[PDB]
Amino acid sequence: KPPVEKLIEELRQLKEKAYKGGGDERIQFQHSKGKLTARERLALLFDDGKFNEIMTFATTRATEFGLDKQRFYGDGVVTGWGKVDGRTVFAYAQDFTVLGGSLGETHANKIVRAYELALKVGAPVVGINDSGGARIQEGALSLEGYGAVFKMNVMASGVIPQITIMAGPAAGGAVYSPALTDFIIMIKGDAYYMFVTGPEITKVVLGEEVSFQDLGGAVVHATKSGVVHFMVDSEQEAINLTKRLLSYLPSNNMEEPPYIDTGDPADRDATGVEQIVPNDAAKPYNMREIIYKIVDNGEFLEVHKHWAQNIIVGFARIAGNVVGIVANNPEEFGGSIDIDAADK
Amino acid sequence: AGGAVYSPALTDFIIMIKGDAYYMFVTGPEITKVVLGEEVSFQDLGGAVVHATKSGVVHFMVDSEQEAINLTKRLLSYLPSNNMEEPPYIDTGDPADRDATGVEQIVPNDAAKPYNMREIIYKIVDNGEFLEVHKHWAQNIIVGFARIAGNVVGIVANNPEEFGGSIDIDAADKAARFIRFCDAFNIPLISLVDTPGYVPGTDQEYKGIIRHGAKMLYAFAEATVPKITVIVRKSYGGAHIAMSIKSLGADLVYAWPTAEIAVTGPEGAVRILYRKEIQQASNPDDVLKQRIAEYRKLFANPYWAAEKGLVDDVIEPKDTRRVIVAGLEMLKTKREYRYPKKHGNIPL
Amino acid sequence: KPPVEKLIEELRQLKEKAYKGGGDERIQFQHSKGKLTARERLALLFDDGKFNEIMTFATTRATEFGLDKQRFYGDGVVTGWGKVDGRTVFAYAQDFTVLGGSLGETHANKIVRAYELALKVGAPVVGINDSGGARIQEGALSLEGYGAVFKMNVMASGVIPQITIMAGPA
C-alpha cells in the first residue's frame, strides 16, 4: 500500500464506517422509538459543529461469545470534549445501536479516560446514557469496567460538576454511575427507565409482575424514589436543560459560579411580596411566588421539582450572581420537613 | 423528643437501653391524638426496639444502663482517640500463623444451602471476638469490629441467612456508614463475599435502592485505609462491585475455591445470552437448563477472574487468616492520593 | 461439582502446574545454562523462601500468533512481596521458561501492580530481570506495557529504592 492520497481516502471511509455505529437500519430503529443517536445528541449539546473525539476506533478485545467477530469501532460509546456556550466540558454518549449500548471493558475505559482528562483540566462531564447494561459476553471484565468508572465518579465528586442524561433503558450496573453523579436528567417515555434488578427476576424471585415503566420509569424516579433530579419530555429538552444547568455552575470547585446576563437593577420592589403571606400562621400560599419576586427576572431552575414538594430547592441569580435556594413549601405537608425533603 | 434526637444522630454510634423510660422520636404522639385519633405509645413510636430493628437509628441495644456503659468502654477499646491515631493494638497477637481448620467446613454442598457467616469470621479473627454493629438491623449484611494479629479491623460480610445475602437499601446504608467511619479512623477493612445481587421489586426501586446502593460504592472508592476482599462464594453483578473489587480500590483480592464471580446470576445471564442460538437445538427441554450448567462450569468459578488478573490469588479457606495478616501487615503504611475538595457529594 | 474438599484438591493441582512455568523440559534448559528459575531466585532472596504472590494465575489476553494456545499461568513473571532480613520488600522475577520471559501486556501489568503497591506502602522493589525483550506476538501492546513500567520507575525514583538483578539476555 503506497500512495498517501489513497491512504487518506481510506481513512475517510473508515471514519464514515465508524460513525454509522450499528448501521442505518438500527439507527432508523432508534429513531422510530423517538430517540436520537449518540452522535446526534452530542452535536445538539456542543457548540454545534464541533466535538473532539478520543479513542474513536478503539474496539473490544474480548473473544468469547463471538465478540471476536463483532468489532464495532468505538466499542459502543463516543467520548471526547467540546465547547458548551464557549466553555469546555467533557462528555460520553453511549450508542444503543452497538450491542444495546452494553458496557464493554474497552467501552468503560474510554469513559474512564474522559473522566481522567476532565479531572486533570478541571472541566465538567455530562454522560448521555443509553445502555441496556453490562456486556454479559465479557463476564467479570464488564463489572470491573463499571467499577473503574464508579471510581472516577467518586474521585471527581465535588471537584467537577457531573451531570447524567438518562436517555436509555438502564438495568443493573448501568444504574450506579448516574447515581454517583450530581444531577440526573431523565426523559419520560417507554424507551427510558432504570432499575437495579429487572422485572423478569423480580418475578421468579418475588413473584410480582411489573412493567418496565412501573418499576423504574422516569416518573417513579422523579416523583417517588428521588433518584432523578429533572424529568423532561424530550431529548432536545434534556440537552437544553443540561446547557441551562451548566450555565449556573463553575467549571470546577476552584472557580466561582459565572456572573451573567444583566437585567437587575438591584433595588428591590416595594409592593406585592408582603401581600402573599396570609394572616393566619397555618394557611398555605405560594412560596415560589416569593422566590420569583426576589430573583433576577423571576427565573428559577428547580431541582427535584416533582419529588418532596415538601421543600423547594433550585438555582437562580441575584443581581447577576448564582445562588442556591432552600425554601419550605406551605402547599405540601404545610411546609413540615420530611425524610424525602431532608434528603433533597 | 424533638431536638434531643439530632445530636445523637450526628454522632457515630448510639447505644440504647431497652425499657419504658422511652427513647426517641422527632415528633411525639400527642399531635397524632389531636388531629387524628391513633393513640401510639412511646415504645411503639420510638422504642429502642423500633430503632435497633427498623429505623436503624440505634447501633446497639442493651438491657440495662450498666450494660450501656460497659459496651461503651468496649467500643472505645476498638477506637483510636482521634484522627491522627492508629487504632489500639492489644493481646500480644502470637496466633498469627495459620487459621484453625474446619473453616472450609462451614460452606455447604451447593450454593443453595445457607450457613452462618459469623462462623467464618469467628474462625478468622483473634479469639473469635467480634463486636457487631447494627446487629438487629439490615441483617442481610454483617458489620463490626474485631482484631487480627492484635490489630483492629472492620468487617463487611454478606449474610447467607437473610434475604440470601442479597443487599438491600437498609443494608447499603448500614455497610456504607460503617465503611466511612472505619476509613476516617484508620481502621482497615475486610470484605467477606457471598451475595447474589440486590433485593428486587418496586418496593426497593421506589425507595431509591439506586441511590442507597451507590453509597457503598462511594464509601469503598473513597476509603484509603487498607482494603482486602475475601470472596467466600457468590459475588454477582453490582453486589460484586459493591463489596470492593480492584477497579473500585481493593488493595488485595482473594477467593476461596468455592467462589463464583459472575457478571449476573448464572441463569439471568443465559436467558439474555442464549436464545437465537439455542431455542433451536437437538432437544427442546434439555438445552433449556443444560446451558445453565454450561455457564457455571465455564464461569461459576474464581479462575476465570484470576486469569484476568481481577483476583490476586485463589487460596484454601484454611489460609484466610494468614493471608489477611500478611496483607494487612504489608498495607499498614499505605498512603493514597485524593483530589482536593471541600468534600464530595455522596448520594443521600 | 458439589465437594468443596475436591475444589481445594483442584486448586493445589492448578497451582502445582502454575509453579512449573514453562515445564520441566524448559526448567532443565534454564538450568543447563547455569541459571536458577524465577522462583528459586525468590526463595533465596526472601526469608524462609516465603513470598506473598499477587496475580498468580493472570494470563495473556492476546489471541494472535498462537498466543491463544500458549497461555501460561502468571504470564511469565512472578510478582509479590516478602521480607528480607525482616523488612518488607517487593519484587518481580521474570520466568525465561515462559516465552523467553518476554514482556507481555499482562506480564507488564503485574510488574506495574507490584510497583504501585510498593510505592503506596513505602517498600523497596527488587527486579530480578530475565527476559529477551518485547513479546513480539503482542505487538505495540507490549511496548505500551514497557512504558507503563518505565512510568512507575520514574514516579518511584527517589521515593523508594529500586534494585535490579540482571539475570538474563536483555
**For testing contact with chain A, the best of C63, C71, C106, C138 (most A CBs within 10 A):** C63
Instruction: Using CA coordinates, name the residue in chain B closest to A184.
Output: B211
**For testing contact with chain C, the best of B103, B247, B307 (most C CBs within 10 A):** B307
Angle, helix C105-121 to helix B320-331, in steps of 10 degrees: 60
Q: Which of B257, B333, B335 lies at the smallest CB-CB distance from C7?
A: B257
Query: In terms of Cα–Cα distance, which of B122, B114, B118, B160 is closest to B140?
Result: B160
Handedness of CA C140, C143, C149, C152 (dihedral sign): negative
User: Torsion over CA of A279, A283, A289 and A294, rounded to 10 degrees?
Assistant: 50
Whether B3 is a known active-site residue: answer yes
- Any chain A CB within 8 A of the CB of B283? no
The per-residue b/e assignment along A187-216, b for 16 or more CB within 10 angstroms, e otherwise, is: bbbebbbbbbbbbebbeebbeeebebbebb
Q: Return d(Cα C75, Cα C59) in angstroms, integer.
A: 5
Distance from B234 to chain C by nearest Cα, in Å?
14
The experimental method, as deposited, was X-ray
In a 13 Å sphere around the CA of B153, the CA atoms on its Cβ side amount to 33
Characterize the bridge pairing of strands A162-166 and A183-187. parallel
Q: Kindly report the CA angle at A250 between A248 and A256, in degrees rounded to 5?
A: 105
Whether B150 is a known active-site residue: answer no
Contacts of B214 in chain A (CB under 8 A): 150, 176, 179-180
Q: Which of residues 234-263 of B touch A (CB under 8 A)?
A: 237-238, 240-241, 245-249, 261-263
Q: Return d(Cα B140, Cα A43) in angstroms, integer.
A: 46
Helix (H) or strand (E) holding B242: helix B237-242
Burial group, residue B273, by CB count within 10 angstroms (0-12, 13-18, 19+) = middle
Contact C104, C38 (CB under 8 A): no
Distances from the Cα of B271 to the Cα of A174, B122, B265, B292, angstroms = 19, 39, 10, 9
Characterize the bridge pairing of strands B252-255 and B313-314. parallel
Distance from B242 to chain A by nearest Cα, in Å?
9
Whether B56 is a known active-site residue: answer no
Q: Return d(Cα A91, Cα A38) in angstroms, integer.
A: 11
Q: Which of residues 32-91 of C touch B (CB under 8 A)?
A: 52-59, 61, 71, 73, 81, 88
Distances from the Cα of A113 to the Cα of A77, A99, B65, B346, angstroms = 12, 21, 55, 22
CB contact under 8 A, B206 and A224: yes
Q: Kindly report the CA angle at A24 between A18 and A25, in degrees rounded to 5?
A: 135
Q: Is A249 left (phi over 0), alpha (psi -120 to 50) or beta?
A: beta
Contact B207, B173 (CB under 8 A): no
Contact B238, B210 (CB under 8 A): no
Fold of A1-261: 2-enoyl-CoA Hydratase; Chain A, domain 1 (3.90.226)
- Any chain A CB within 8 A of the CB of B209? yes
Contact B35, B51 (CB under 8 A): no
Catalytic residue among B2, B102, B128, B344: B2
User: In this structure, which amino acid lies at residue C77?
Assistant: V
Characterize the bridge pairing of strands A301-303 and A311-318. antiparallel
Characterize the bridge pairing of strands B260-262 and A125-129. unpaired
Contact B261, B233 (CB under 8 A): no
Contacts of A61 in chain C (CB under 8 A): 61
Instruction: Using CA coordinates, name the residue in chain A closest to C68.
Output: A63
Question: How many CB atoms neighbour CB B235 within 10 A?
Answer: 32
Distances from the Cα of B5 to the Cα of A89, B25, B51, B64, angstroms = 44, 7, 12, 20
Dump the DSSP string for A126-175. EEEE---SB-GGGTHHHHHHHHHHHHHHHHHTTTS-EEEEE-SEEEGGGG
Distance from A199 to chain B by nearest Cα, in Å?
8
Contact B229, B250 (CB under 8 A): yes
CB contact under 8 A, B258 and C4: yes
Handedness of CA B296, B300, B304, B305 (dihedral sign): positive
User: Which residues of chain C have a Cβ shorter than 8 Å from any chain A Cβ?
Assistant: 61, 63, 68
Contact C4, B107 (CB under 8 A): yes
3-state DSSP call for residue C147?
helix
Query: In terms of Cα–Cα distance, which of C123, C118, C37 is closest to C74?
Result: C37
Secondary structure (H, E, C), C69-104: CCCCCCCCEEEEEEEECCEEEEEEEECCCCHHHCEC
- Which cell is B281 given? 437445538
Contact C112, C105 (CB under 8 A): no
- Which cell is C130 given? 530475565
Query: In terms of Cα–Cα distance, which of A115, A107, A31, A38 is closest to A73?
Result: A107
Name the residue with cell 428486587: B200
- Which cell is C110 given? 503485574
Q: Return d(Cα B158, Cα A21) in angstroms, integer.
A: 41
What helix, strand, coil percent values describe chain B, rounded to 5?
40, 15, 45
Distance from C32 to chain B by nearest Cα, in Å?
31
User: Torsion over CA of A101, A102, A105 and A108, rounded to 10 degrees?
Assistant: 60
- Which cell is A92 given? 460520553
Contacts of B296 in chain A (CB under 8 A): none
Q: Return d(Cα B307, Cα C73) in angstroms, integer.
A: 7
User: In this structure, which amino acid lies at residue A57?
Assistant: F
The per-residue b/e assignment along B170-202, b for 16 or more CB within 10 angstroms, e otherwise, is: bbbbbbbbbbbbbbebbbbbbbbbbbbbbbbbb
Catalytic residue among B3, B37, B201, B309: B3
CB contact under 8 A, C121 and B335: yes
Q: Return d(Cα A36, Cα A42) in angstroms, integer.
A: 10
Q: How many helices (H) and strands (E) does chain C have?
A: 5, 5
3-state DSSP call for residue B284?
coil
Secondary structure (H, E, C), A177-232: HHHHCCEEEEECCCCCEEECCCHHHHHHCCCCCCCHHHHHEHHHHHHHHCCCCEEE
Q: Output DSSP code: residue B54.
A: I
Chains touching chain B through at least 3 C-beta pairs below 8 angstroms are: A, C
- Which cell is A175 given? 444504574
Q: How many helices (H) and strands (E) does chain A have?
A: 13, 12
The dihedrals phi and psi of B262, each to the nearest 5 degrees, come to -125, 145
Across chain A, which distance is largest between two alpha carbons, in Å? 87
Q: Return d(Cα B251, Cα B230) in angstroms, integer.
A: 11
Dump the DSSP string for B121-158. HHHHSGGG--EETTTTSSTTEEEEEEEETTEEEEEEEE
**Which residues are CB-contacts of A181 (< 8 A; sequence separation ≥ 6)?**
A127, A153, A162, A163, A164
Query: In terms of Cα–Cα distance, which of A39, A37, A31 is closest to A56?
Result: A39
Distance from B208 to chain A by nearest Cα, in Å?
4
Characterize the bridge pairing of strands B151-158 and B141-148. antiparallel
Distance from B275 to chain A by nearest Cα, in Å?
13
Burial group, residue A157, by CB count within 10 angstroms (0-12, 13-18, 19+) = buried
> Radius of gyration over alpha carbons of chain C, in Å?
16
Instruction: Using CA coordinates, name the residue in chain C closest to B296.
Output: C1
Q: Return d(Cα A172, Cα A149) in angstroms, integer.
A: 14
Q: Which of B204, B264, B346 lies at the smallest CB-CB distance from A136?
A: B264
Q: Output DSSP code: residue B191.
A: E
Contacts of B109 in chain C (CB under 8 A): 2-4
- Any chain A CB within 8 A of the CB of B197? yes
Instruction: Using CA coordinates, name the residue in chain C closest to A62.
Output: C61
Contact A102, A132 (CB under 8 A): yes
Q: Return d(Cα A61, Cα A67) in angstroms, integer.
A: 8
3-state DSSP call for residue B5?
helix
Q: Which of residues 265-324 of A touch B (CB under 8 A)?
A: none
Fold of C1-170: 2-enoyl-CoA Hydratase; Chain A, domain 1 (3.90.226)
Q: Return d(Cα B272, Cα B183) in angstroms, integer.
A: 39
Q: What residues does each domain of chain C span?
A: 1-170
Q: Return d(Cα B329, Cα C88) in angstroms, integer.
A: 9
> Radius of gyration over alpha carbons of chain B, in Å?
22
Whether B239 is a known active-site residue: answer yes
Distance from B267 to chain A by nearest Cα, in Å?
10
Contacts of C63 in chain A (CB under 8 A): 63, 68
Contacts of C68 in chain A (CB under 8 A): 63
Q: Which of residues 119-138 of B touch C (CB under 8 A)?
A: none
Distances from the Cα of C43 to the Cα of A167, B48, C40, angstroms = 56, 57, 5
Name the residue with cell 504470564: C75
Q: Return d(Cα A206, Cα A211) in angstroms, integer.
A: 14
Q: Which of B312, B317, B334 lies at the smallest CB-CB distance from C54?
A: B312
Catalytic residue among B52, B146, B157, B239: B239
CB contact under 8 A, C68 and A68: no
Contacts of A224 in chain B (CB under 8 A): 206-207
Alpha carbon C23 to its chain's center: 15
Q: Return d(Cα A78, Cα A100) in angstroms, integer.
A: 14
Catalytic residue among B56, B238, B249, B268: B238
Query: In terms of Cα–Cα distance, which of C116, C119, C123, C51 is closest to C89?
Result: C123
Q: Is B301 left (phi over 0), alpha (psi -120 to 50) or beta?
A: beta
Chains touching chain C through at least 3 C-beta pairs below 8 angstroms are: A, B
